[PDB]
């Protein structure tokens, strides 16, 4: 491939796509939570369910999306999905009857994001081979910037318009993504038979259970009997900025580690993520707690950004789409079941110091799993046993 030149506009499209998708998926939930803080709940336990249904629909639909990207092209899918998402976000403006809004926001939106998101990762590989880590790092950092700036963006520019009407504004971003999707240009379970890939997929899936809880459920602890001077917004924005920096750095470092050896980064990040969370209840000293949270933000980059390059390395470019699709398919149920499990474990034990103790087992187990991923040379050695 060109490995440069024109390939720097595709990064712009991918950054825009990821930023818009996740910015909407977080801002809509946050804004409805604010509205519920301002308005009555009359449905109550289902209204908060939307923010999880729509998110989970993205990952739970990827397995089928991978048979449209690989069967039509990285452009047509990435534009039709954006069009569907635009239509979904447009009709949501009407009266918010439970079932009607439920459908219009969980089956039109979210489902369209699944079509408009998986192609945003495949195409980059088709433009970078030796620098792909750098491109992925840049894209992840830009998407983090976009997400962290989006809810504030719509809030400030929203002009304090009512939620039902403000759904129309978000519709424009999907249309722009549809137009920007024009920039993309092309330059079954068979994949599971590769043991070296299936074991890695299992290792990633196991650590999902312990990734969402500490990364999202964190503020409850400082809201629960510990914090006296909270200013937690500072903590959250610090974690976001450090996650951006970590993603940017991890993108480049993978450029250095040759070939399959990259996976050792994932092991060293999973182990430290697991250990750190276990130290959050113990390192109560607010300065130390802030430092540990800062570390948590940095550890994020190695977790997510470096997954796509390793996926390309393991199976090459011709099967990157299917492998990534079936990897994202397995992270839906483990990821979406974590927060409820922690929030009911706090009830089982009655104090909110144990959720974190549960938050460190899944990722350490996953790290133990990844450490045994066979080397290509060793896998060949076993292959030499065929005779």
């Amino acid at each position, epitope marked *: 491939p060109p490995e440069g030149g024109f390939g720097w506009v595709v990064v712009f499209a991918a950054t825009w796509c990821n930023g818009s998708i996740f910015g909407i998926h977080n801002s809509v939930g946050i804004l409805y939570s604010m509205l519920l803080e301002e308005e009555k709940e009359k449905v109550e336990f289902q209204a908060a369910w939307v923010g999880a249904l729509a998110m989970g629909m993205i990952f739970f639909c990827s397995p089928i999306v991978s048979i449209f990207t690989d069967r039509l092209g990285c452009r047509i899918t990435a534009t039709a999905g954006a069009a569907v998402a635009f239509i979904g976000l447009h009709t949501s403006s009407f009266t918010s009857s439970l079932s009607l809004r439920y459908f219009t926001y969980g089956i039109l939106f979210g489902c369209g994001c699944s079509f408009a998101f998986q192609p945003s990762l495949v195409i980059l590989g088709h433009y970078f081979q030796r620098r792909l880590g750098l491109a992925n790092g840049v894209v992840s950092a830009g998407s983090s910037i976009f997400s962290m700036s989006f809810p504030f963006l719509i809030r400030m520019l929203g002009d304090k318009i009512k939620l039902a009407q403000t759904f129309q504004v978000l519709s424009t971003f999907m249309f722009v993504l549809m137009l920007l999707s024009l920039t993309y240009r092309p330059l079954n379970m068979r994949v599971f038979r590769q043991r070296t890939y299936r074991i890695w997929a299992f290792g990633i899936a196991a650590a999902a259970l312990g990734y969402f809880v500490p990364y999202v459920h964190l503020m409850k602890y400082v809201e629960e009997e510990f914090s006296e001077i909270k200013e937690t917004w500072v903590l959250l924005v610090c974690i976001g900025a450090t996650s951006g920096l970590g993603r940017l750095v991890s993108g480049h470092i993978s450029d250095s580690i040759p070939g399959l050896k990259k996976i050792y980064l994932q092991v060293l990040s999973f182990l430290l993520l697991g250990l750190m969370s276990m130290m959050i209840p113990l390192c109560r000293d607010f300065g130390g707690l802030i430092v540990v949270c800062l570390f948590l933000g940095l550890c994020d980059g190695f977790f997510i950004t470096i997954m796509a390059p390793i996926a390309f390395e393991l199976v090459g470019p011709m099967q990157a789409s299917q492998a990534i699709g079936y990897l994202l398919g397995m992270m839906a149920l483990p990821m979406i079941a974590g927060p409820p499990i922690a929030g009911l474990l706090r009830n089982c034990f009655g104090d909110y110091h144990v959720a974190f103790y549960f938050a460190g087992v899944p990722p350490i187990i996953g790290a133990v799993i990844l450490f045994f991923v066979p*080397s*290509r*040379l*060793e896998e*060949e*050695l*076993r292959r*030499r*046993l065929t*005779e």
Partner: nanobody
Amino acid sequence: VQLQESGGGLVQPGGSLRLSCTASGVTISALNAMAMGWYRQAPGERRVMVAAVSERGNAMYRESVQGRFTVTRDFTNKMVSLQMDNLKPEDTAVYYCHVLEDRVDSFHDYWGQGTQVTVSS
């Protein structure tokens, strides 16, 4: 690059044997990213691997010999060592020392002349 011939031995049942080989012309840097081991060819049997040691230092074994024969990398001397214990009459075979190289297209192979190993029945 070639592995010098070595090995062999006639032993009684239950006996032990020690073997090794030498790598000629290989640099220590070139030795890394490669694995070394041994192969077996019993009467009427095709040349099949016995047990080797990977680049990471661990060893993969064949079903019929795992837990019976042991080897080590000996990377320091650019050599390889093989040892045996509790040999039995059916263990007789011609053992060939082989070295596999890491190569992007396909792993490259070196192997010297093996020697006959027989256990008296």
